[PDB]
Design a protein around this ligand. Structure first.
Ligand SMILES: CCCCCC[C@@H]1NC[C@@H](O)[C@H](O)[C@H]1C(=O)O
Ligand SMILES: CCCCCC[C@@H]1NC[C@@H](O)[C@H](O)[C@H]1C(=O)O
Lengths: 597, 587
């Protein structure tokens, strides 16, 4: 049971603020020598939140595999003698184990979701405790995402993985201590139903030794509904709906009264209905059309570290270009992202970190498990770890009205028997963990309409298609034919709504061509344009998401010229020519509505 | 009187949690309608700290001149009923006025220094107060740095100024709320002396409480102790940078307050052709810098500081100049705490009307331009810099201004009071004023009111363009001319050439990486031949944003690094020189 921290009977002191002591451990003696005991040797200042790889311009820190130590002292605020205090890590990429002054208090696997522990017994209010963090950036076959650690003859660990983006690690987001009353709200769940768009209710179901009443206050803070019951309610309402263009928010505030002290938790709600009918995706009983991007949490110097200016600027760009939706590509994003999405009515495809369950999308000319689904590779523990990743993503983003669909994985290889054996239970478990949202699994190119094995276990079909790029390279005529043929094949086979969640081409900013050859800005424009002409001719396609909003870092190889260049913007957010192409189509269309051509 | 908040009896909650409501005021009715009354509407989220220009990819926000509105609520923590609580803005670039629920708690002019006010009478602990800030980015002749606003025919403002870097504005740094005990230290002053194995550290810990001071070590084990005033003997170097800690106890019987403040034991002084740190002949190596970065403008960011310091350490720089304004206080904590030599400078740039582009007041020193009010604001800006960076050991010299025009009559009236007054505002640090190329040896009027004079020279770039043999001859002859003409130590605070990353040439044509390399090598060979100059700082460390014009290809491109911090070929050239010399000792 987890909620995002906020105010009044609750209060934060964040240690996000500032520089920590940081150290490597090339021989992994930190645990043996109990480094959490003393203040570190060999410590250098590092900034949190932020990846550790790019911060020191050193290829050895950058390419490190192992454990790293983050440590900082802090003064525990003194008006906190009688309240309950928690230590919350909003993300520690891959694995983290924390000591609060010689006392292990938490441990976590999963680099993208928050994890907290009550630390009341282990701290002296009014004085300073020392926080030590042990961070592991290693991936094996039971981590979400999977990878393999390669140890050379000399014990240097080098991490290989099967996804594009670079394996940035560290404390990527918020680290804070926050206090709730000893009687406190611990979890909230809100569900919205709507009929003729002027007439429904907000079911609730709450959970910590406190009798609870909930007021549903206005944007004007005018109250229009009231309930009581730990097992919640159905507050019935005639309302203004949370819509894609505007995203209205009521405020449902839950009051947890114990007979002495009280706690109250403010939770914003968007009144909207999501469903799939035939080949139509409907938000509030109207067929929506998705436009926008796959994104990444990547940026210069800070890696995957959260940054407010970046969020403000990237939403300004996305707003300008006319995007209405995005997918949290290949891991759960910072919650600040989803909060922004709620206030602005941005439609979001929420996705777990389950990427790389595929051993066919390689560079060439170089020792893998020859069976993807097996005891050596993706096995039962992997499945359990995956289900737990689904449970953490859902427990954190269930109430967000902007999250409109759950993505279980991205681009697994579905051809082997055992893909369906691995995925079907996860598809079912996910539906039972949130029956109010449709479910998806993003589908790779070579698992075509004929060969794919699991897409009928999901509500929406999300395709990643690169005809004319990785195959039929340079050939816009042939690729157009292939793309039309496979889209009609998919619509014939499943009669589900189709979103093209990935389509894009590597483009060097400033490379121009009078031909329309690959890597050129002219080719990025003509290729996106040919895709758009096809989408507009297939009734089932309800959504387009250009593969990347910006250029991002990847591991080194012959396929990646300083990373992935499929961005519409450069890594410093400057637009390639295709940006204006996109802006013309996406602002020239009626909002949320499929282009009539 | 100023110092940075810390936490043992005092406590901060920073409102730097960035997202504030933000709005323009294009018809300038915000003050009239008292927008601080209600929450701003027609408001959009903005990140604090950070400049407001570049955050929104909007050219109308970017080039705006006027007032902008920043607003955020905060819940004042309830364990704060009896202490004194202050609202601290570490910097609001150019002008700021704060309302804490209607009570206009402050004002500040001067965009690079902090300003704080006690807000206890106007705050109820346990609930949220509404914070409204009005920041103005406009410049006149009475501002630091100076500028002129011209209004076109339709009431549209265009802000013109005379310094290179772009006029970024907004809440550039920390906004923190911090609570002290009701008898509290308000200021600290420390001075260190050292002889040629032993010496003393004066203090003056201006507070309502008796004073006791502990000098704890890095072990925080005691080495001297006192009880306003001291002078203590003992029994901080560039490569290493040690720091002791004096802890101040303001002892009262009603309540107690304590302040921890770091100190560096080192001595700086000049004569002959030598600048000596702890009685040792220094050589400055390093950079002119800027607080500039993508999307955030001049906004402070910790990752940027960690990365840029990794870069300067790798390349072999031991020093930098806080070019054209006072930097982040955290900059100087890093420099003290890492032993970086810092030439500290105020925001006195653009006092010159002579090298703009081609294609205005007709005398610079007069009431129309540089007037008496300008004298006041300049003196006050010098004094705010002095009050905030007085205790920092890394500061090794103070820069009163950068690149004024000294040729018009009257420069010496404006300047003499500021040099006398500033020397009188700290005799423990030497003073300089950076002078432009065209005020050469024969022409310059004021180089003798300062302890060291710092030259910005660009021969072979703006003059003798491409002519590197001829430029060599000029640089050598006027360098020797300066050495004979004042026999002061000389630091070269600026030398660099615009270099487009990826432009390469089999000739050595301007704007090319080969040209930057060849030009820097020729300059370096030139200095190796003048006993007098004790400091080299390549002009800019990274490419930075400027206002638009035919001289600036998407900004200034003189950086050794690009704006995304990638090295040009010259970066390695510099590394070879600065790694190949013995530390602090020039060939
Ligand atoms: C032949 C199949 C090619 C799949 C390649 C498409 C990949 N999908 C996942 C994304 O994270 C990658 O960046 C994308 C790519 O490589 O740019
Ligand atoms: C004839 C030109 C005289 C030198 C003027 C050179 C200028 N000095 C001041 C710095 O702020 C500028 O960045 C520098 C430049 O080039 O960008």
């Amino acid at each position: 049971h987890m909620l995002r921290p906020v105010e009044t009977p609750t209060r934060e002191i964040k240690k996000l603020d500032g520089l920590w002591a940081f150290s490597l451990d090339r021989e992994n003696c930190g645990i043996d020598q109990r480094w959490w005991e003393s203040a570190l040797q060999e410590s250098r200042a590092i900034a949190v939140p932020g990846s550790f790889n790019d911060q020191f311009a050193d290829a050895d820190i950058r390419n490190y595999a192992g454990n790293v130590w983050y440590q900082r002292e802090v003064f525990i605020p003194k008006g906190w003698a009688g309240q309950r205090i928690v230590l919350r890590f909003d993300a520690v990429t891959h694995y983290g184990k924390v000591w609060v002054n010689n006392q292990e208090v938490m441990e976590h696997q999963g680099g993208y979701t928050p994890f907290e522990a009550d630390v009341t017994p282990y701290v002296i209010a009014g004085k300073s405790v020392r926080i030590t963090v042990c961070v592991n950036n290693e991936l094996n076959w039971q981590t979400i995402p999977p990878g393999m650690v390669i140890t050379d003859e000399n014990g240097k660990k080098k991490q290989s993985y099967f996804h594009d983006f670079f394996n940035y690690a560290g404390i990527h987001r918020s680290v804070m201590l926050y206090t709730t009353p000893n009687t406190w709200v611990d979890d909230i769940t809100v569900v919205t139903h709507v009929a003729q768009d002027c007439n429904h209710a907000s079911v609730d179901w709450q959970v910590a030794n406190g009798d609870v009443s909930v007021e549903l206050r206005d944007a004007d803070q005018q109250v229009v509904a009231t309930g009581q019951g730990t097992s919640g309610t159905l507050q019935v309402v005639n309302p203004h709906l949370w819509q894609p263009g505007e995203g209205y928010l009521y405020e449902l505030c839950v009051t947890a009264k114990s007979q002495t002290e009280c706690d109250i938790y403010p939770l914003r709600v968007g009144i909207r209905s999501v469903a799939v009918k035939g080949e139509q995706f409907l938000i509030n009983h109207k067929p929506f059309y998705f436009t926008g991007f796959g994104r990444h949490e990547d940026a210069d110097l800070r890696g995957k570290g959260f940054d407010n200016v970046l969020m403000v600027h990237d939403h300004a760009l996305m707003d300008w270009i006319g995007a209405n939706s995005y997918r949290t590509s290949h891991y759960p994003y910072a919650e600040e992202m989803l909060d922004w999405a709620d206030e602005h009515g941005i439609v979001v495809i929420d996705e777990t970190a389950a990427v790389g369950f595929n051993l066919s999308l390689g560079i060439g000319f170089e020792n893998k498990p020859k069976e993807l689904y097996s005891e050596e590779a993706v096995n039962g523990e992997t499945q359990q770890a995956h289900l737990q990743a689904i449970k953490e993503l859902i427990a954190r983003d269930k109430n967000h009205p902007s999250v409109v669909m759950w993505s279980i994985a991205n681009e697994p290889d579905t051809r082997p028997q055992g893909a369906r054996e691995y995925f079907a239970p996860l598809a079912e478990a996910t539906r039972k963990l949130d029956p109010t949202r449709p479910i998806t699994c993003v589908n790779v190119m070579f698992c075509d309409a004929h060969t794919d094995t699991i897409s009928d276990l999901f509500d929406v079909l999300c395709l990643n298609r690169y005809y004319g790029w990785y195959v039929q390279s340079g050939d816009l005529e042939t690729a157009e034919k292939v793309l039309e043929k496979e889209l009609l094949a998919w619509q014939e086979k499943l009669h589900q709504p189709i979103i093209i969640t990935e389509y894009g081409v590597d483009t060097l900013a400033g490379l121009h061509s009078m031909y329309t050859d690959m890597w050129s800005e002219e080719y990025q424009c003509a290729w996106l344009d040919m895709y758009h002409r096809v989408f507009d001719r297939v009734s089932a396609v309800v959504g387009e998401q250009v593969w990347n909003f910006a250029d991002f870092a990847t591991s080194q190889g012959i396929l990646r010229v300083g990373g992935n260049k499929k961005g519409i913007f450069t890594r410093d957010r400057k637009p390639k020519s295709a940006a204006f192409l996109l802006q013309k189509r996406w602002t020239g269309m009626n909002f949320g509505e499929k282009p009539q051509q």
